Write a structure and sequence with these properties.
This is part of a larger assembly, with one copy of chain A (1285 residues), one copy of chain B (72 residues) and three copies of chain C. Chain A is an alpha+beta fold. Chain A is 33% helix and 10% strand. Chain A has 41 helices and 35 strands. By secondary structure, chain C is mostly helical. Chain C has one domain. Classes of the chains: A alpha+beta (1285), B mainly alpha (72), C mainly alpha (97). Chains in contact: A-B, A-C, A-D, A-E, B-C. The structure holds magnesium ion and zinc ion (2 copies). One zinc ion binds next to loops of chain A. Chain A: Keywords: Acetylation, Antibiotic resistance, DNA-directed RNA polymerase, Magnesium, Metal-binding, Nucleotidyltransferase, Transcription, Transferase, Zinc.
Chain lengths: 1285, 72, 97, 49, 50
DNA sequence: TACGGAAAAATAACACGGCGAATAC
DNA sequence: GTATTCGCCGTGAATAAAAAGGGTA
RNA sequence: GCCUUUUUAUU
């Protein structure tokens, strides 16, 4: 099959699926386990329960395949044929479908142009409709005697089916087509544009409206709801057939009208409870108080087929046990147990036994395995000598959770997961029990060796740093070697080479760390020099490859230092000398850690003598602050900020006093003067290396742990004065748990949110596959690193690392189609230029994917991204992976740089200050080399001490402003005249000071009159709640103040990726022009801009509690905020631009990513917003086919536009819509991929009424339908499939 | 084998390497096809990758070997 | 718990859970995305069809591994046929082309 | 939750929309829950179950 | 906070159009008068509740 | 050997966005 | 006609073990 | 031969 078409079930199509008709409500017989005639499990209707055995017991021995008997009529067949054959029931009354009824919007409600409330009153027999208008039961007795001969009315779904039979599809669509062309409505147009979209999609899929109302209801096959020695579905099916049989008992005896309306309602409620649960008048519960599982409850949610049985299928030839260290084995190897791998490779044993000829059958080969003799293990090691085996963690919130290995047979039922990939799994050896998998066939084993092996998984897909990072022990063995000590054994002796240092240390006459001179041979060709190298660093030179330099080895080699040592070996040496180098790091870092003896103890770290004096000073410092509060010197808020000020300064004073007692404490007499050298404490060796302890973790260990947080978010006033070495107090440990149990409740609850964020990120980005090599488009975004902070954290070295540029930047410097390598990115760093135009993901215009050169580098391989790789899945897995890592004033230019102001119409002031006039100002600290390092967005009203275009020295205050009061600044100088500014009506004066009244609390005498201030030209208007200190008759300058106007992490990733509006959205300006005040007597301020060439009647809606950023006297610009606060993701796309929203979502996700310390590349978020920009709202139809009000995909309007550019008619433009990770994953094509995410009761009704025959594109679709993935080597199969079709 | 970086530099794309090694493994399993590499005790997964280590098996020259078997 | 072949579930043709039920390891929706991230198209097609879904395939695979041939055949997954009958049991038409 | 009068509040950004909220919960040992919740429209509304 | 001034037998206690401090609370307690003069527009903003 | 479902249960009562429906101005 | 609040509705990680319960007289 | 709830426990 190549496509799956979904539509409405016809009454003839339901009977075409069913081979028989069921009439019995009871499932089977009560006495024996044999089904009755015309039952739910009957063999005549569906098929026999045994393999080639009739129900009576006469036709056996497999001598027939399609015989039909005459005694019982049972068509004997296989057991799996019973899983396919279905049944149907003939209902006495029609029944409305509950999925199409309770959906939002209602499919039955939009056809009958009724809301949800009245469309269910006629269905459950409370009201009547005609065959329209809705009349109740008490209006039906008067309708038969007044208009009874003109119109006829019924109730239930029979009247709904008769009304859908009366209306026509072409007649109702014509009446709605002429209504949308002439209407001045926005909210009413939204209700009508979804109704005509429902009608226009019926004629394209050829679905009648009467097919939605079910006259015939199909049932499941009996193997789909099997009885067991009582289920949660067959008892629910007994609720429907009992109601179906009772309605057949009412027609023959001429039942009255009162009893048939109640029986049809319970028949309608039985189908409403069968096909759905939770969307009715009352959800049906079982006998044991649990909610009963309906047909919808077993298709949606975690317990549905889409998540438990189509995405969560259990896997044979696959086991699960805890993981171990296993230091003796190689990187591509692990450890599989003897009796476990024998049970996993059980047909692999049977294949090798029949190949050699030991057991040439399947029966005696099972006896050879279960006997466990000596010849079974020699067969087993030949199979598992080079067989790849997938090691798999049960939570995989990352790409590296599934890695292949080449295991060896060991004792013990635990797997020996490799320590080098232990940081790649992000899972320590804390007793975690996790799965294991094998590939059976040879085309799947090569996928494990070429892609899933641990050898070629060195670099992380998230960042340029390798994911193979030595975490705790191998880095500790490396750190004890690479150290310098005076007065050591064998100090100041010559060595012939690096291999002689192994002879020097294993004999025991010299220490592991001694300042000597070893001869080394460095490569790129061989150079030799006698440099200062200790004994431990000389062990490393036999471990590193030839071409690795020495300048990366000569440091202390901590965890942060050897992260680049593994990266430089991948860069210039290649992958083939990386696997041997990484294994020999793990061989040396483990074996020398045994010889190291780096431990933890009470004699290792020591409480410094300055700690007991600092705590005695801090307890004496809080005594005078508390005595000042009793006398009344400070307030409650000023005292609370002062205690944390003097304790965090004491926490930083005890941090440095404890650090020097671990850095330069223990000294040894080196035959002379007592010199200050680095201490050899094992706690500092685990702290300077950054292996397992940070600078703040040892601060909590030997010193006081500092300020702890409250559960609501505040800080404890009195922190822990003691430390963990001498023990805490009872209350000190109790307030220590206020941040520890809170952080662990933060950890155990954000994994349910980041796990939901992992599903939300993949399900919207699974359609995006790289499909082209080169397209030819020069469109892209402008790249700028983080500048708003004081110090640069992520520069342009790691920002544009491995991304092909769109347009060639200047100092011809770089080409266009050339990928930026590690040498090309360093060429951009030495030039010190910014504003690089690179090819972005949202700028590529291809079908169901992006180009390979428009993406960049994979950052997991050394070359470019391969054509046919899941490019949206590798990024969405590296977004939820830091989700469980993060938690759920004046200016002072410290650095040196020349100031620069953009889009500022600065004028002269009275004192010569660089006064600003625009709202959106951004400072640029341009250096002498040509780049910038610092930036600040100062508010409107900041007085700059110096102008623009000169150098600003470091440590000098350049500006100052007031954040609480917003002033107003004119443009030119001149006399001031109070135009329309009178007192008594709208201006009162409080004592020497003037103030304008608020628009809400003012009287009814000055509501129409608005104040103004014109020059004597430009007119300046002031808003309410302002203080005017200027009197009439005083000459003022341009920069003088005229009106004083006074006033976590994972939710930020969740709110921004869903493209939702926050609690304080920032309003943007549509057309640059003149903004007025607004209109009163409305309850909310409205914004209107009437420029010369703009749109006049456009109006906004601003609440009264919000304030206006820009003034109504100054000219507004497109891209200036009206409300202060966080910018809304929907308004930055529609107004500022398409390339502006992809810069805002990335830089704000990366803003909260730097607070935790994780490094995620910017292109990984850029492939998510491309799957958020793939839905668009077309602004004009023109020569196109679909309606303007209809919202379709960007991939559908881009191929249709290229067809128009080849023709004579022009192409219709479109406006993109930022549908989030929840919105765009549902309202899209490939309905199989949308039904697995969520809203299976809704999006399957959205696809049945609209056709939506998917073209087998997408990754979630091919997983559920079970065929080759179009984002691997199956893309080459899909490439040949397009060549076949 | 240990690493696949020497076989991927002959073909380029990684997903094209799996397609040519799977078709080489099908010939070594059912239809004879003794390899030109020295045969060792390892399985046919490594033999499908050892032939691309020196470059005697490629995706372009494996299709002309399938047509050569069809002419005989 | 290790399972090569054993008793399957009666609702859908899939393995079971627990060591007492021979220990069929559940893959899960989180591990499908980690398998398709590398581009393992032949492995992900095996992991949810030949292991569980293909009842006509897992017996032909079990006759193929004991023969000595590691060849995977494309088949119609019966676990999707479990899903195909669930939508066909409602008033929604769905077919294959 | 103990049976009695519970005065709750959700400040910050949880169902606030720029205003503080005060909901009073009278819960029994058994029966129907009685709630008195506010709104951004500044009108006391009663909630039962 | 009211825009008008509250008088009691020719004694001005609350200034018109100005927020008073806490000094007028204790000063008013010693000379409690049960009748003051109020304009007609201040009562129209209230509810009658009877 | 029969009906499967209703009203009482001396029921269990969450939280953060979202979509459509019933009002105030 | 235009918002506006709200009733109901989407979602709330993943993975192993034990227990009852599988309609009521 | 199972399935679904609930509880405990693990990452
Ligand atoms: Mg763990
Ligand atoms: Zn028979
Ligand atoms: Zn492109």
């Amino acid at each position: 099959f190549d496509a799956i078409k979904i539509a409405l079930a016809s009454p003839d199509m339901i009977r075409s699926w069913s081979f028989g008709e069921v009439k019995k409500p009871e499932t089977i017989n009560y006495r024996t386990f044999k089904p009755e005639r015309d039952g739910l499990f009957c063999a005549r209707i569906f098929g026999p329960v045994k393999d080639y055995e009739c129900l009576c017991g006469k036709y056996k021995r497999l001598k027939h395949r399609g015989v039909i008997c005459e005694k019982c009529g049972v068509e004997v067949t296989q057991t799996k044929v019973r899983r396919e054959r279905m049944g149907h029931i003939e209902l006495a009354s029609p029944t409305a479908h509950i999925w199409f009824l309770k959906s939002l919007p209602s499919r039955i409600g939009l056809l009958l142009d009724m809301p949800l409330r009245d469309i269910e009153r006629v269905l459950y027999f409370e009201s009547y409709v005609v065959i329209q208008q809705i009349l109740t039961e008490e209006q039906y007795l008067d309708a038969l005697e007044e208009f009874g001969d003109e119109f006829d009315a019924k109730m239930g779904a029979e009247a709904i089916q008769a009304l859908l039979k009366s209306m026509d599809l072409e007649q109702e669509c014509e009446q709605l087509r002429e209504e949308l062309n002439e209407t001045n409505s926005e909210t009413k147009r939204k209700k009508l544009t979804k109704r005509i979209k429902l009608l226009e999609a019926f004629v394209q899929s050829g679905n009648k409206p009467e097919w939605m109302i079910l006259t015939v209801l199909p049932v499941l096959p009996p193997d789909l709801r099997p009885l067991v020695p009582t289920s949660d579905l067959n008892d629910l099916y007994r609720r429907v057939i009992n109601r179906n049989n009772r309605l057949k008992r009412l027609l023959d005896l001429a039942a009255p009208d009162i009893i048939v309306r109640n029986e049809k309602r319970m028949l309608q409620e039985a189908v409403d409870a069968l096909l759905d649960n939770g969307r009715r008048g009352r959800a049906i519960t079982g006998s044991n108080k649990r909610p009963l599982k309906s047909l919808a409850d077993m298709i949606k949610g975690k317990q549905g087929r889409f998540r438990q049985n189509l995405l969560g299928k259990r896997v044979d030839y696959s086991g699960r046990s805890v993981i171990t260290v296993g230091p003796y084995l190689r990187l591509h190897q692990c450890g599989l147990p003897k009796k476990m791998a024998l049970e996993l490779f059980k047909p692999f044993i049977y294949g090798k036994l029949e190949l050699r000829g030991l057991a040439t059958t399947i029966k005696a080969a099972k006896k050879m395995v279960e006997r466990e003799e000596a010849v079974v293990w020699d067969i087993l090691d030949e199979v598992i000598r080079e067989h790849p085996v997938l090691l798999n963690r049960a939570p995989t919130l990352h790409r590296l959770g599934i890695q292949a290995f080449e295991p060896v047979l060991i004792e013990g039922k635990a797997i020996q997961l490799h320590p080098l990939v232990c940081a790649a799994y992000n899972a320590d050896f804390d007793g975690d029990q996790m799965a294991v998998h094998v590939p059976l066939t040879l085309e799947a084993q090569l996928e494990a060796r070429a892609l899933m092996m641990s050898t070629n998984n060195i670099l992380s897909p998230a960042n340029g740093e390798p994911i193979i990072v030595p975490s705790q022990d191998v880095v500790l063995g490396l750190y004890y070697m690479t150290r310098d000590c005076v007065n050591a054994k064998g100090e100041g002796m010559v060595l012939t080479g690096p291999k002689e240092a192994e002879r020097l240390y294993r004999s025991g006459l010299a220490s592991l760390h001694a300042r000597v001179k070893v001869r080394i041979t460095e490569y790129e060709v061989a150079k030799t020099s006698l440099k200062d190298t200790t004994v431990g660093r000389a062990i490393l030179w036999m471990i590193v490859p030839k071409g690795l330099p020495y300048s990366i080895v000569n440091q202390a080699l901590g965890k942060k230092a050897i992260s680049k040592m593994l990266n430089t070996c991948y860069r210039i040496l290649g992958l083939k000398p990386t696997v041997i180098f990484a294994d020999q790091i793990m061989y040396t870092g483990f074996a020398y850690a045994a010889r190291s003896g780096a431990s933890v103890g009470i004699d290792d770290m020591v409480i410094p003598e300055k700690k007991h004096e600092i705590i005695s000073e801090a307890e004496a410092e809080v005594a005078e602050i508390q005595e000042q509060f009793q006398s009344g010197l400070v307030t409650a808020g000023e005292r609370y900020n002062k205690v944390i000020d003097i304790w965090a300064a004491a926490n930083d004073r005890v941090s440095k006093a404890m650090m020097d007692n671990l850095q330069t404490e223990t000294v040894i007499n080196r035959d002379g003067q007592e010199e200050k050298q680095v201490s050899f404490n094992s706690i500092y060796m685990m702290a300077d290396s950054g292996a397992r302890g940070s600078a703040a973790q040892i601060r909590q260990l030997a010193g006081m742990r500092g300020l702890m947080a409250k559960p609501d978010g505040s800080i404890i006033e009195t922190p822990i004065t003691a430390n963990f070495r001498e023990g805490l107090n009872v209350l000190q440990y109790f307030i220590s748990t206020h941040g520890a149990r809170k952080g662990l409740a933060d950890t155990a609850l954000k994994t349910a949110n980041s796990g939901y964020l992992t599903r939300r990120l993949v399900d919207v980005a699974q359609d995006l596959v790289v499909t082209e090599d080169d397209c030819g488009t020069h469109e892209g975004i402008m790249m700028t690193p983080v500048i708003e902070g004081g110090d640069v954290k992520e520069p342009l070295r790691d920002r544009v690392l491995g991304r092909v540029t769109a347009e060639d930047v200047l100092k011809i410097l770089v080409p266009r189609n050339t990928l930026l390598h590690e040498q090309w990115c360093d060429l951009l760093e030495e030039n010190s230029v910014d504003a690089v135009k690179v090819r972005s993901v949202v700028s590529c215009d291809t079908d169901f994917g992006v180009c390979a050169h428009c993406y960049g580098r994979d950052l997991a391989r050394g070359h470019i991204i391969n054509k046919g790789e899941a490019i949206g899945v590798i990024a969405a897995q590296s977004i939820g992976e830091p989700g469980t890592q993060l938690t759920m004033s004046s200016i002072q230019v410290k650095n040196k740089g020349s100031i620069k102001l953009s889009n500022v119409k600065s004028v002269v002031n009275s004192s010569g200050k660089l006064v600003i006039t625009s709202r959106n100002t951004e400072l640029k600290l341009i250096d002498e080399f040509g780049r910038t390092k610092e930036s600040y967005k100062v508010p409107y009203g900041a007085v700059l001490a110096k102008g623009d275009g000169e150098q600003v020295a470091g440590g000098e205050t350049v500006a100052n402003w007031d954040p609480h009061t917003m002033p107003v600044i004119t443009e030119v100088s001149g006399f001031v005249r109070f135009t329309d500014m009178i007192d008594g009506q709208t201006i009162t004066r409080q004592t020497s000071s003037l103030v304008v009244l608020d628009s809400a609390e003012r009287t009814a005498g000055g509501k129409d009159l608005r104040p103004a201030l014109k020059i004597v030209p430009a007119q300046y208007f002031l808003p309410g709640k302002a203080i005017v200190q200027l009197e009439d008759g005083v000459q003022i300058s341009s920069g003088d103040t005229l009106a004083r106007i006074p006033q976590g992490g994972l939710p930020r990733v969740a709110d921004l990726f869903e493209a939702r509006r926050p609690k304080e959205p920032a309003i943007l300006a549509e057309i640059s022009g003149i903004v007025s005040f607004g209109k009163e007597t409305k309850g909310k301020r409205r914004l209107v801009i009437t420029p010369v060439d703009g749109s006049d009647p456009y109006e906004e809606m601003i609440p009264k509690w919000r304030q206006l950023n820009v003034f109504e006297g100054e000219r507004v610009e497109r891209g200036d905020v009206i409300s202060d606060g966080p910018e809304a993701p929907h308004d930055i796309l529609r107004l500022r631009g398409v390339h502006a929203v992809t810069r805002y979502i990335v830089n704000e996700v990366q803003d909260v990513y730097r607070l935790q310390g994780v490094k995620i590349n910017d292109k990984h978020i850029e492939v998510i917003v491309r799957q958020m920009l793939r839905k668009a709202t077309i602004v004009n139809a023109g020569s196109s086919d679909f309606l303007e009000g209809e919202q379709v995909e960007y991939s559908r309007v881009k191929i249709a536009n290229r067809e128009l550019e080849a023709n004579g008619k022009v192409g219709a433009t479109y406006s993109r819509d930022l549908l989030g990770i929840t919105k765009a994953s549902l309202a899209t094509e490939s309905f199989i991929s949308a039904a697995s995410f969520q809203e299976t009761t809704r999006v399957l009704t959205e696809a049945a009424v609209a056709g939506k025959r998917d073209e087998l594109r997408g990754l979630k679709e091919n997983v559920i339908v079970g065929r080759l993935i179009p984002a691997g080597t199956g893309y080459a199969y899909h490439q040949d499939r397009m060549r076949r079709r | 084998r240990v690493t696949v970086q020497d076989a991927v530099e002959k073909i380029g794309n990684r997903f094209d390497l799996v397609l040519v090694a799977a078709r080489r493994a099908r010939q070594m399993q059912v239809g004879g096809k003794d390899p030109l590499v020295p045969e060792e005790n390892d399985k046919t997964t490594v033999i499908a990758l050892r032939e691309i280590e020196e470059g005697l098996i490629n995706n372009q020259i494996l299709d002309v070997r399938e047509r050569q078997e069809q002419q005989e | 718990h290790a399972r090569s072949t054993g008793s399957y579930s009666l609702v859908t043709q899939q393995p079971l859970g627990g060591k007492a039920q021979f220990g069929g390891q559940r893959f899960g929706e989180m591990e499908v995305w980690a398998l398709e991230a590398y581009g393992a198209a032949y492995t992900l097609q095996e992991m949810l069809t030949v292991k569980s879904d293909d009842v006509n395939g897992r017996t032909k695979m079990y006759k193929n591994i004991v023969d000595g041939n590691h060849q995977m055949e494309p088949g119609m997954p019966e676990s999707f046929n479990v899903l195909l009958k669930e939508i066909r049991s409602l008033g929604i038409n769905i077919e294959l082309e | 939750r103990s049976p009695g009068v519970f005065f709750d509040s959700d400040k910050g950004k949880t169902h606030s929309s720029g205003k503080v909220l005060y909901n009073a919960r009278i819960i029994p040992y058994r029966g129907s829950w009685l709630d008195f919740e506010f709104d951004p429209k500044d009108n006391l509304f009663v909630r039962i179950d | 906070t009211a825009s008008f001034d509250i008088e009691a037998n020719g004694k001005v206690y609350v200034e018109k159009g100005r927020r008073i401090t806490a000094r007028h609370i204790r000063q008013l307690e010693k000379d409690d008068v049960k009748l003051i003069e109020v304009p007609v527009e201040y009562i129209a903003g209230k509810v009658v509740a009877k």
